[PDB]
Write a protein that binds this ligand. Structure first.
Ligand SMILES: [Ca+2]
Ligand SMILES: [Ca+2]
Ligand SMILES: [Ca+2]
Ligand SMILES: [Ca+2]
Ligand SMILES: [Zn+2]
Ligand SMILES: [Zn+2]
Length: 367
């Protein structure tokens, strides 16, 4: 996080805010809701409170304006700058302006008022742009269908006003770092020559032949998917990639969730209704066998037969000597299975049912 130069800060802890005019793009109700919830994100992690007023001046004056609109920060029509807010302070201080030749929404369509307002109000309280890609204050517009403060945002805002008067203290997701040797993965899959690691709302993509890591929201590519993947694998045969969460599984082609999916695992792969979820999955280069891992047991399914194999609720620790009895993630590369469990990574050889290397979970990255 980065605190606005000069460290402007509101002196009162009980602030007032007013919505001057309303955008035509939405019903007043929807605008009101967006703003309210935007303020709440901030009041949840600090002692500050925001009260909506109707008449008269307020600390934070909110408005929808078009082009040059009386303040020296002219808007640029459709596109470009969506909004801007001023530092805490008297007058125009703390005010937020949304550019009206923007198409404010309440859905996944660009640009969602709640999301942009949550960000603007940040500047309204004294925060500047963060260099943390996962932070709400980051300079951009991403939409993971659920606006929330990243741990970085909380630290930034608490540094100016103190922490929540909550006895528990809210927390926010932390952005994974590739050079942290404490890194662990929710799931991993290969895709058109690259390896794609998943962790919370993020993903880390790499081509092992030229180590250079790409970090970003899973929603940048597949907005439909629910954040919190548990397993995943590629099936280049159909050029798809399947993700598992809960007990249903989404399939994807290119950058769009295929028709109908999600779908049930039981009806799609044939798995006893006993299995709640899944821990990890991989598919053999060109053998047609796909291995799914649950708990300490594993199962095999034949793609070219839309069906499992004769009695397969077998043991992990037994047929995969060395990796232990629980898989966090796994993917295949050049004939070897790469198993992940916590920060541990075992390079397993299918042929010799042998373990060649035992590395750190993030060993692939350049650190
Ligand atoms: Ca604009
Ligand atoms: Ca003001
Ligand atoms: Ca508009
Ligand atoms: Ca997992
Ligand atoms: Zn303005
Ligand atoms: Zn900003």
């Amino acid at each position: 996080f980065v605190l606005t130069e000069g460290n402007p800060r509101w002196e009162q802890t009980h602030l007032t805010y007013r919505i001057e005019n309303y955008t035509p793009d939405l019903p007043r109700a929807d605008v009101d809701h967006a703003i309210e919830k935007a303020f709440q994100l901030w009041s949840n992690v600090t002692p500050l409170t925001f009260t909506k007023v109707s008449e008269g001046q307020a600390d934070i004056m909110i408005s929808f304006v078009r082009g040059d609109h009386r303040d020296n920060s002219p808007f640029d029509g459709p596109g470009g700058n969506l909004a801007h807010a001023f530092q805490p302070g008297p007058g125009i201080g703390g005010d937020a302006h949304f550019d009206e030749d923007e198409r404010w929404t309440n859905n996944f369509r660009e640009y969602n008022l709640h999301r942009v307002a949550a960000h603007a109000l940040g500047h309204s309280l004294g925060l500047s742009h963060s260099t943390d890609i996962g932070a709400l204050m980051y300079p951009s517009y991403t939409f993971s269908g659920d606006v929330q403060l990243a741990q970085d945002d909380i630290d930034g805002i608490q540094a100016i006003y103190g922490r929540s008067q909550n006895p528990v203290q809210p927390i926010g997701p932390q952005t994974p770092k590739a050079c942290d040797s404490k890194l662990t993965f929710d799931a991993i899959t290969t895709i058109r020559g690259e390896v794609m690691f998943f962790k919370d709302r993020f993903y880390m993509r790499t081509n092992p032949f030229y180590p250079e890591v790409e970090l970003n929201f899973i929603s940048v590519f597949w907005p439909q998917l629910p954040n919190g993947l548990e397993a995943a694998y590629e099936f280049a045969d159909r050029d798809e990639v399947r993700f598992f969460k809960g007990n249903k599984y989404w399939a994807v082609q290119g950058q769009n969730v295929l028709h109908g999916y999600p779908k049930d695992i039981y009806s799609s792969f044939g798995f006893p209704r006993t299995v709640k979820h899944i821990d990890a999955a991989l598919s053999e280069e060109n053998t047609g066998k796909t291995y799914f891992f649950v708990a300490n047991k594993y199962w095999r399914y034949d793609e070219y037969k839309r069906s499992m194999d004769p009695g397969y609720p077998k043991m992990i620790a037994h047929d995969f000597p060395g990796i232990g009895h629980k898989v966090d993630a796994v993917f295949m590369k050049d004939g070897f299975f790469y198993f992940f469990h916590g920060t541990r990574q075992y390079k397993f050889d299918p042929k010799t049912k042998r373990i060649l290397t035992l590395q750190k979970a993030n060993s692939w990255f350049n650190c």
